[PDB]
Design a binder for this molecule. Structure first.
Ligand code: MNH
Length: 152
């Protein structure tokens, strides 16, 4: 679990994602696809995207960015009483989308990167440790549901 102070830090930082949810979400997805181009094949509608400028110019990619970060926002605000939120998310990602836990680790990393990049020296040692622990918990709780289901 995180501590109370650790959640407060997580949620304060998520305060800044919510000022520009679309632009954060899009930078997240662009970090992901360019560092890990196999993740791009999971999206039928994004594999016409050969360049960054193409990625950067896509409103549909930004739309997905928002869907992603909005649902993570909800999850985070439940502070690890997040089972009702998280369980059907895990099921769709295992059975339908077929997203390996490794791609989830890649997007966690992309979110840490994007918080540092968009908030240079405003996202400190302490806040970065708590967000990492919060994303680890997210990932741990999905991994458990994945194991149940035999996914990988
Ligand atoms: C945090 C990480 C994270 C969150 C909160 C997340 C939340 C969602 C939500 C909400 C939806 C819409 C409802 C659903 O269950 O289909 C959705 C659809 C999707 N998700 Mn994912 N998703 C990922 C990471 C996430 N997704 C990653 C990483 C992959 C890709 C490599 C991915 C690929 C999808 C695909 C593909 C869809 C369906 C896209 C479409 O509409 O065509 N994702």
């Amino acid at each position: 679990g995180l501590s109370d102070g650790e959640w407060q830090q997580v949620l304060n930082v998520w305060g800044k994602v919510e000022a520009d949810i679309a632009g954060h979400g899009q930078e997240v997805l662009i970090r992901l696809f360019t560092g890990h181009p196999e993740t791009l094949e999971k999206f039928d509608k994004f594999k016409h995207l050969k360049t960054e400028a193409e990625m950067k110019a896509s409103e549909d990619l930004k739309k997905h960015g928002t869907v992603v970060l909005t649902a993570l926002g909800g999850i985070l605000k439940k502070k690890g009483h997040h089972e009702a939120e998280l369980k059907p998310l895990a099921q769709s990602h295992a059975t339908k989308h077929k997203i390996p836990i490794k791609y989830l680790e890649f997007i966690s990393d992309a979110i840490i990167h994007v918080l540092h990049s968009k908030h240079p020296g405003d996202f400190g040692a302490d806040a970065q440790g708590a967000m990492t622990k919060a994303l680890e918990l997210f990932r741990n709780d999905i991994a458990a549901k994945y194991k149940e289901l035999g996914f990988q």
